[PDB]
Amino acid sequence: LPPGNHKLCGPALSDAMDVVCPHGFNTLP
Amino acid sequence: LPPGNHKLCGPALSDAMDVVCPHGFNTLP
Amino acid sequence: GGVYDECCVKTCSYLELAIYCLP
Amino acid sequence: GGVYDECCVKTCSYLELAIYCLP
Amino acid sequence: PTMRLSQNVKPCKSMDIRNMVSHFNQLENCTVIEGFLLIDLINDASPLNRSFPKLTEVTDYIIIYRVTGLHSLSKIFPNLSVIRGNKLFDGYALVVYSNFDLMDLGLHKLRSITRGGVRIEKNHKLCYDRTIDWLEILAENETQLVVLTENGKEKECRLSKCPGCQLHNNRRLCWNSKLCQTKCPEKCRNNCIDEHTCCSQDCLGGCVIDKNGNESCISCRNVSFNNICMDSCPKGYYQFDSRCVTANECITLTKFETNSVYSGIPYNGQCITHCPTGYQKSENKRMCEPCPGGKCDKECSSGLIDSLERAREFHGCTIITGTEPLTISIKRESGAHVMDELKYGLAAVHKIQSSLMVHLTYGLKSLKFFQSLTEISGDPPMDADKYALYVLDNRDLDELWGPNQTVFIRKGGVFFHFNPKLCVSTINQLLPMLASKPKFFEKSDVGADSNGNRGSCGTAVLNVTLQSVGANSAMLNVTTKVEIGEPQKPSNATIVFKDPRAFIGFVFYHMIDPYGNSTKSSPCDDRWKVSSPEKSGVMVLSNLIPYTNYSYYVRTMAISSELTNAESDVKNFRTNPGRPSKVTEVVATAISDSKINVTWSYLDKPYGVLTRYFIKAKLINRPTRNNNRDYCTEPLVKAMENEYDDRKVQAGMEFENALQNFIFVPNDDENTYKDEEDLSSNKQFYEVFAKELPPNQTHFVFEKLRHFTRYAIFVVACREEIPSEKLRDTSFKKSLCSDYDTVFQTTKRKKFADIVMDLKVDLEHESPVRVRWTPPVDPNGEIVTYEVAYKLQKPDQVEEKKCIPAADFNQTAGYLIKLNEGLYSFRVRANSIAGYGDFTEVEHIKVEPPP
Amino acid sequence: PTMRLSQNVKPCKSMDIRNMVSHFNQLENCTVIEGFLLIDLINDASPLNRSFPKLTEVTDYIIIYRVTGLHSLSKIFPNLSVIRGNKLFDGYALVVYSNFDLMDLGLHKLRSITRGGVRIEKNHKLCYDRTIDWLEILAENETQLVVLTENGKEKECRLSKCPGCQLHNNRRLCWNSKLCQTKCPEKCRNNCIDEHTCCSQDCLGGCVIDKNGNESCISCRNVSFNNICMDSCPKGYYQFDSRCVTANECITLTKFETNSVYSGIPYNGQCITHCPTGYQKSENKRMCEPCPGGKCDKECSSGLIDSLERAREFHGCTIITGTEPLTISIKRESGAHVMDELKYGLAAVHKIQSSLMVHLTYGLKSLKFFQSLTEISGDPPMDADKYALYVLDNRDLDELWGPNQTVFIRKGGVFFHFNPKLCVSTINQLLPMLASKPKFFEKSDVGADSNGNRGSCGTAVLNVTLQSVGANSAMLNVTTKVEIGEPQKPSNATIVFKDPRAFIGFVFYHMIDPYGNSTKSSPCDDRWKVSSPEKSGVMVLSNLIPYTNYSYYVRTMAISSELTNAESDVKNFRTNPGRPSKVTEVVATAISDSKINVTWSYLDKPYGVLTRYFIKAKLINRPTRNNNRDYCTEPLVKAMENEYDDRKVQAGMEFENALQNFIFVPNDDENTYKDEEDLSSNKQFYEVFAKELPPNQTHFVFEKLRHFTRYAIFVVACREEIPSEKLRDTSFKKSLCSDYDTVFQTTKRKKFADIVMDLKVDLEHESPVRVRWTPPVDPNGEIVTYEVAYKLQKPDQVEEKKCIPAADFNQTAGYLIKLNEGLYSFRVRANSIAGYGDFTEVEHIKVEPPP
Numbered sequence A, B: 001l002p003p004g005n006h007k008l009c010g011p012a013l014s015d016a017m018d019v020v021c022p023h024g025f026n027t028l029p
Numbered sequence C, D: 001g002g003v004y005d006e007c008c009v010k011t012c013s014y015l016e017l018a019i020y021c022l023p
Numbered sequence E, F: 001p002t003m004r005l006s007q008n009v010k011p012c013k014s015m016d017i018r019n020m021v022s023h024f025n026q027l028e029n030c031t032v033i034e035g036f037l038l039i040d041l042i043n044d045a046s047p048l049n050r051s052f053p054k055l056t057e058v059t060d061y062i063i064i065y066r067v068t069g070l071h072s073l074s075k076i077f078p079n080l081s082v083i084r085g086n087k088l089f090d091g092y093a094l095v096v097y098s099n100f101d102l103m104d105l106g107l108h109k110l111r112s113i114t115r116g117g118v119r120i121e122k123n124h125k126l127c128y129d130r131t132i133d134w135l136e137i138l139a140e141n142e143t144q145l146v147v148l149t150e151n152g153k154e155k156e157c158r159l160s161k162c163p164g165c166q167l168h169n170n171r172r173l174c175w176n177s178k179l180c181q182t183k184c185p186e187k188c189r190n191n192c193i194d195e196h197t198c199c200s201q202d203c204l205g206g207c208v209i210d211k212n213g214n215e216s217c218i219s220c221r222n223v224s225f226n227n228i229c230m231d232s233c234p235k236g237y238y239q240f241d242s243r244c245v246t247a248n249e250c251i252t253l254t255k256f257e258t259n260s261v262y263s264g265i266p267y268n269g270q271c272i273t274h275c276p277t278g279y280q281k282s283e284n285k286r287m288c289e290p291c292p293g294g295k296c297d298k299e300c301s302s303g304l305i306d307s308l309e310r311a312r313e314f315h316g317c318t319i320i321t322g323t324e325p326l327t328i329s330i331k332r333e334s335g336a337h338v339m340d341e342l343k344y345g346l347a348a349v350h351k352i353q354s355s356l357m358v359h360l361t362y363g364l365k366s367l368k369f370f371q372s373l374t375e376i377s378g379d380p381p382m383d384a385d386k387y388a389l390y391v392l393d394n395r396d397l398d399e400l401w402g403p404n405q406t407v408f409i410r411k412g413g414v415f416f417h418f419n420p421k422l423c424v425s426t427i428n429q430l431l432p433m434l435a436s437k438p439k440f441f442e443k444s445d446v447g448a449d450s451n452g453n454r455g456s457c458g459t460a461v462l463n464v465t466l467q468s469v470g471a472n473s474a475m476l477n478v479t480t481k482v483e484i485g486e487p488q489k490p491s492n493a494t495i496v497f498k499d500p501r502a503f504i505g506f507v508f509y510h511m512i513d514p515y516g517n518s519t520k521s522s523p524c525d526d527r528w529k530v531s532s533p534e535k536s537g538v539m540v541l542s543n544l545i546p547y548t549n550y551s552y553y554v555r556t557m558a559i560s561s562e563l564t565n566a567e568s569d570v571k572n573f574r575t576n577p578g579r580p581s582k583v584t585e586v587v588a589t590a591i592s593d594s595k596i597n598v599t600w601s602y603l604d605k606p607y608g609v610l611t612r613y614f615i616k617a618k619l620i621n622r623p624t625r626n627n628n629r630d631y632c633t634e635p636l637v638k639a640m641e642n643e644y645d646d647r648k649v650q651a652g653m654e655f656e657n658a659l660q661n662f663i664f665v666p667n668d669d670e671n672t673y674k675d676e677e678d679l680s681s682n683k684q685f686y687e688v689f690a691k692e693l694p695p696n697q698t699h700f701v702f703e704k705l706r707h708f709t710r711y712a713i714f715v716v717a718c719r720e721e722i723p724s725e726k727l728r729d730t731s732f733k734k735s736l737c738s739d740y741d742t743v744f745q746t747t748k749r750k751k752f753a754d755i756v757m758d759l760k761v762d763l764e765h766e767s768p769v770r771v772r773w774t775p776p777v778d779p780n781g782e783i784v785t786y787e788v789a790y791k792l793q794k795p796d797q798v799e800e801k802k803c804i805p806a807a808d809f810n811q812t813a814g815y816l817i818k819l820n821e822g823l824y825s826f827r828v829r830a831n832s833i834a835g836y837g838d839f840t841e842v843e844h845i846k847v848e849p850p851p
């Protein structure tokens, strides 16, 4: 989690999105 | 016999040789 | 740019990647 | 060079090819 | 006609159901969605305490990505009917993606999809989805966008049986077994409210009979105004997708696009987001007006395009600039709307300052969508600035530009490899368009065998002639004379080869094909059997099975370095009739002692036309009396027993050249038969019986045959004859009738006929009694002994019986039997190969010896 | 030590038989050929009336090209024995090419070839092509170059009879139809005068022995002087290829070379036509002198190389210059001497001003022969100055410049494609060579897919571990933990994939191999069966044949664009014993009334090892007496009567990326048994019999059974048990012994034995007569009736007999018969379900009642 390079891809990226911040997202408009 | 290009090759070359030169070959040495 | 622009091509850090999910 | 160098590549004429003859 | 649509609509702009279910409170009262509707990242949809039947219609598309805690889509889409697809997300119109909790779709009222298609992915628990016929619900012309995957199909999703409506089309079609698909008849294809209640062409998405008994559209097909359907909007109103609004309203309308929001511009009766060709937005953005110089130029930095959605961003851009190449890398499955989305995204560009590149695309049929392109300036090329047009690994690319389309190339070199469907000739058409005007492309830049190898395009045609055919053999003949060696007077059926050796020989293929449509071989395909290379140009197919249609085709085989390839069309022909096969399941059985029956079938190939069936029956002699047996001391009943090869020729050629360079120096039977029967001299029975039968028959009876006898059965099936055979084949070859196997008959009830007759007795004087009898007309089996019985006409007297081996009692006028005083009766029966006969009636004799 | 050579030498220089027969006179008197001997374009060799037995040895080679009218080589080569190949034309020492009239070689005296191989081609009439064991004649190490083709061997050569010398090594090595090759033992290989008679190593090809003991060599192996053999020449002389010569003789000597004649130079004890490296010929060309600066900078124009013989022209050249590239295009088959010849022809070159190129070569293992090469100037690089080292289509090239070799490159780019064995890693070793010092080669220059596809170079290894095995199943588990995404502290036995989706999954191959030597799959090879891709890393082999060895190996499957490949070694393992199969060909037979025999084989797989055989015999008795019978009227004798694979993934990946880019936004069987036989109640016989047998057996007999019985035979084979099956598992699920099939042998074993005995007769008071008898020891097959007979002791009387249903006569103490006056004898026998017995002996009674 700490390191900042992390060539993150695909499903790993999707799951990391949730684990990093499950509260919510901005929505498009 | 007439044409000047006549790209002879392989067995055709030898066959044309042994007739266009029907009587002898001057040997190497 | 988009997520696939900053991550999964080149490389991105989590703390920078947190921008997508502000409250 | 020889026959295969003079003919069958950069094809030659029969008249020139006669050089390989006349013992 | 013009009429009211069901209910009054309250359209609302796109909605974003995100994070938590509470945002559903923004979706109520929305009859239709003026844009797209996306549901993403609901951690738990179970708390949904409502359904929204009012929502019926959506304009752009539906994506359900990573929604969790939702079992079916019915709860949120009770009445979702149609997806107009005015906008596409990567070309798809309904996407249901990566959901762990979706059991069933629930789209009961889904009725029509206008554009794009459907993608369903990574929904493990979804079922019944693989039942619906997506091709019927989509637009008829391009129904290919129906992709689905990993819907738990392996073992767990076997409960998709549907109500098996049940098994229509031999398949289930249901949104869970609770329901089944609402198919429509072809007369109103997907334009019905039920399987027989069609709908008018004015409506789209369905129609409901109103309280007045008249139709009411679910949604207007062309446009809608004041809840009424019409073809076009009234004056002063502009079409915004599915309804007409004033200019003032259109100014307020908006649609989201690629991290941007574009307001609607009332133009030419339509509410528009991007001005049409030759137009640019006004300074106030309230209208479009003609562009100066015919078209406003616009510049966009070059960048990769890994999918259609990215391509949409380049809409309306005339100039692509920057050192970065415009790397197209689309990867579709099947040729979906890519050809049209890319057209929308790039039809405007007319010249590129950078260099184009098409690395690794799938489903990209051509670069024809660069409609306005005129010049690839290629100012900064790439790859050490070597190349200005770089095409690579395009698994489905087959043609570069539009027909006779001219586009300049100002710099750099072209590049082409691994494009299986790109024929080489199509590449060379660029030769007159480069700045350097190369006469030909060097092998370093343009591949030789890696391009177009899969395209039946570069094949010179051979005029194969089928010479002669036979029972099992056929001869082929390649008519096209070959220009081997000098090209002296070319164009004589060229098929040229620069030297006699490079051409190793012709290759013939053949394979059994009653349908005559086998495709040419691709490299493990084993359908075709091949023969070794042949140089003379004639081959003799052998060991063919008679009268079988064989597909065959020819091609030239040459050393890999040579490239003057040619082929032939896949012609086909049939062998000759040959000889019919043996009859199958032949059995003989009795009807009576003289009526006999035979059964057979023909479950093997007849090889031709079965002109007739032939059966021949002939008897065999019975065994005679044998002296190695005893009779009447032991009873007798006796039921009847009745490769590439490249290296070798290459090495030979090279060595031959090296040697030339050095040697020289300057200075039982049926061949024929006639229908007939042979009648015995006494006329009692037919010894033999040979007749024809029609091809209808499979079993027949033959009567008036000898009893107590075996009849050898011989069966045949005979074939037709070709005119060329009959006109010459007098006695040779022939073989027009099949193989056979003798069948012998276990004839039941062939015994016990004619028994014995005329029994009489007499005495010589304890006077012995001579007993006489007559043998039957036909021996009940060859007689081996005669049994004789007698009894005394007194109570409790047993009937004695004795025997004689027969044929020896006659010289005594009968069989002598010791007898005593009294009145007696006698009986006789036959003992033969068939066992005992029946005892004949009685005759009496009285004994009264005098002294 | 020291030994004479046969005959006195009269050498004649290189010879050419040309045009006409009369030129054969040039062969006069000369025993050996000091050069090469070629015969070609002799239109008709028949008029040759003589032979030339003196000719025995030829220094360089023999080529017979296009000689017509010659039947065999015996006539012109009677005693030709040794071909020493000092000069080796094109790497072939004996050539016989394109002759229509040659039938039989006739080279009886040929024994040894010192250098090069042998090529025979286009001699349609040549029979006996395959007879000779060439590999013995050639140098033992590199025997590969023996090539023969289109000799007419297909069908026409029916005269391959040969003397069967006979079929040694199942190959008749016959010269002509009658002569044959004489082999030599390894101690004197190809140096023997007959089959066993050897010769010392001083000679070559053997030696002749005479009555005087004056053994003389066929030809000296090392050198010769004054007709005597020695290792080296005496001082003051020079070695010339067979013999020692003076300085003047060397000056006069000559040899032909590539359209030139070079006179030998007497140098350092040898007469050689070329000075050694670092030396140059004198102005008078009488001696050699050291090269200035240690290197004579001779230069030659660059030009194509078509075969080895061409390469010799570059001998001694240092600088290859000219705009033309030095295109190497050698084409061998199993290149034997390519390396050495090219070394002789190019070892001198150190700097190339042009650009090298090696296009379409076969058998060119490496470029190691450029020994002295140091710098490819590439000043005019080929292909529009693009490239300075061009490589292509080299079907057998595998490695570039030799170990620790370094060469500079001043211009242009490298190029590589279609080289099967050339691994990419070996190419990348040139990265530090170029003047531009590229960090890597771009995909346009180096064909990373094509190059090295056939070489086991980049195969990263996997620690495949066999987890568990079973009767028909086994589980595989791959230990290597694959990095996905994050680098995760590399150097951990990594195997990496930069994108989780790119990794489709592992692939397990397996196949039955008792020897465990199956090679990895090439593309139509079907030995290996392969399971579907798997991602977890564990697979469960199923349905294996028990106790069968299986080879398996693991490969990683990734989308084609990905390139992080890995594999495993071909490990081998065997399944468990399983259960043995049925016994084959089981038959039972009766030896006597109490002794039985059984025969069987085991021609099916036992699996495991057959610890023991076991047989169980059970007696199953007949049913009781049946009333559906009649006696004395129905008697019985009663014998016995009983693909893309990636498009889907690629499309999924791209669509996933596009969707991600948009969603987010910033802000009755033997269960158990033991040996046993059960006695009858009276212990007269064994009711059942069950015993183990040793695995030696195939047939055995069983003893002390009772007469006339149905002993059902049950047979089985039992396998071993693995320790884990007996200590890690207990006595349940058994499966220890095979399936079985009952064998029945219900014969009338074997004699009459006993039917009835102890008959006696009495009478009640023509008084009725009572007959008594005793039943047999055991029923002769379930006695059903008794046949009772009597006769009168008077002439012409016959025996009368009756029947009873048994067990009824006892009520009267015997069967009662009405009998008249006289003396009578009585007999009785039982009849059973097993048929008749034999009538017991007689006993007499006389009737004499009083009134």
Ligand SMILES: *[C@@H]1O[C@H](CO)[C@@H](O)[C@H](O)[C@H]1NC(C)=O
Residues within 6 Å of the ligand: E028, E029
């Ligand atoms: C909006 O929906 C609510 C139900 O949540 C309903 O009570 C209200 O009447 C609706 N208003 C309109 C204008 O449709």
Ligand SMILES: *[C@@H]1O[C@H](CO)[C@@H](O)[C@H](O)[C@H]1NC(C)=O
Residues within 6 Å of the ligand: E022, E025, E049, E050
């Ligand atoms: C359903 O939930 C909404 C809020 O999300 C609330 O306004 C409404 O009263 C609820 N209705 C029922 C029946 O629970």
Ligand SMILES: *[C@@H]1O[C@H](CO)[C@@H](O)[C@H](O)[C@H]1NC(C)=O
Residues within 6 Å of the ligand: E402, E403, E404, E405
């Ligand atoms: C050039 O091609 C276009 C379509 O690509 C076609 O409409 C036009 O007629 C063509 N012109 C000629 C001269 O063939």
Ligand SMILES: *[C@@H]1O[C@H](CO)[C@@H](O)[C@H](O)[C@H]1NC(C)=O
Residues within 6 Å of the ligand: E461, E462, E463, E480, E493
């Ligand atoms: C071979 O057939 C094709 C098509 O039938 C025809 O166009 C061609 O002229 C034929 N070739 C010859 C040499 O007749």
Ligand SMILES: *[C@@H]1O[C@H](CO)[C@@H](O)[C@H](O)[C@H]1NC(C)=O
Residues within 6 Å of the ligand: E465, E467, E477, E478, E479, E538
């Ligand atoms: C058929 O083959 C023969 C040679 O086998 C040839 O002479 C003839 O021309 C061929 N047929 C045709 C129509 O060319």
Ligand SMILES: *[C@@H]1O[C@H](CO)[C@@H](O)[C@H](O)[C@H]1NC(C)=O
Residues within 6 Å of the ligand: E514, E515, E549, E572, E573, E574
């Ligand atoms: C086989 O070919 C002949 C013509 O050569 C055709 O009449 C026949 O229909 C073909 N066989 C079948 C099964 O169609």
Ligand SMILES: *[C@@H]1O[C@H](CO)[C@@H](O)[C@H](O)[C@H]1NC(C)=O
Residues within 6 Å of the ligand: E515, E516, E517, E518
């Ligand atoms: C083509 O042949 C295949 C079998 O090879 C057959 O299944 C198919 O029906 C045929 N179709 C036509 C149009 O002949």
Ligand SMILES: *[C@@H]1O[C@H](CO)[C@@H](O)[C@H](O)[C@H]1NC(C)=O
Residues within 6 Å of the ligand: E694, E696
């Ligand atoms: C039986 O054969 C006759 C010709 O003899 C034919 O007309 C008739 O159709 C056949 N029967 C059937 C059922 O085809």
Ligand SMILES: *[C@@H]1O[C@H](CO)[C@@H](O)[C@H](O)[C@H]1NC(C)=O
Residues within 6 Å of the ligand: E589, E590, E597, E598, E599, E699, E700, E701
């Ligand atoms: C007798 O032959 C007829 C046809 O010829 C058939 O239908 C019937 O089954 C046969 N009966 C027997 C007993 O073979």
Ligand SMILES: *[C@@H]1O[C@H](CO)[C@@H](O)[C@H](O)[C@H]1NC(C)=O
Residues within 6 Å of the ligand: F028, F029
């Ligand atoms: C061999 O040479 C001698 C002279 O030295 C000559 O007389 C003789 O004829 C030659 N051999 C033959 C077979 O002629």
Ligand SMILES: *[C@@H]1O[C@H](CO)[C@@H](O)[C@H](O)[C@H]1NC(C)=O
Residues within 6 Å of the ligand: F024, F025, F049, F050
């Ligand atoms: C045989 O040939 C030789 C030449 O090699 C010649 O001298 C001699 O006269 C010939 N003999 C006959 C009988 O022709």
Ligand SMILES: *[C@@H]1O[C@H](CO)[C@@H](O)[C@H](O)[C@H]1NC(C)=O
Residues within 6 Å of the ligand: F461, F462, F463, F493
């Ligand atoms: C087993 O794994 C180790 C790394 O821990 C590796 O070095 C070794 O090569 C592997 N086994 C084989 C046979 O390569």
Ligand SMILES: *[C@@H]1O[C@H](CO)[C@@H](O)[C@H](O)[C@H]1NC(C)=O
Residues within 6 Å of the ligand: F465, F467, F477, F478, F479, F538
């Ligand atoms: C595979 O083996 C490793 C150790 O070699 C072990 O840690 C792992 O649990 C095994 N995997 C399975 C599925 O048993």
Ligand SMILES: *[C@@H]1O[C@H](CO)[C@@H](O)[C@H](O)[C@H]1NC(C)=O
Residues within 6 Å of the ligand: F514, F515, F549, F572, F573, F574
């Ligand atoms: C099978 O492999 C085992 C070792 O696992 C070995 O002992 C056995 O010999 C192999 N089978 C054969 C037939 O060699």
Ligand SMILES: *[C@@H]1O[C@H](CO)[C@@H](O)[C@H](O)[C@H]1NC(C)=O
Residues within 6 Å of the ligand: F515, F516, F517, F518, F519
């Ligand atoms: C494996 O080795 C055995 C040794 O007897 C040999 O017979 C067999 O051909 C070999 N198989 C392979 C595929 O190398």
Ligand SMILES: *[C@@H]1O[C@H](CO)[C@@H](O)[C@H](O)[C@H]1NC(C)=O
Residues within 6 Å of the ligand: F589, F597, F598, F599, F699, F700, F701
């Ligand atoms: C009979 O038994 C003997 C051993 O007692 C055996 O060798 C022989 O093969 C058996 N033969 C038959 C026919 O059972």
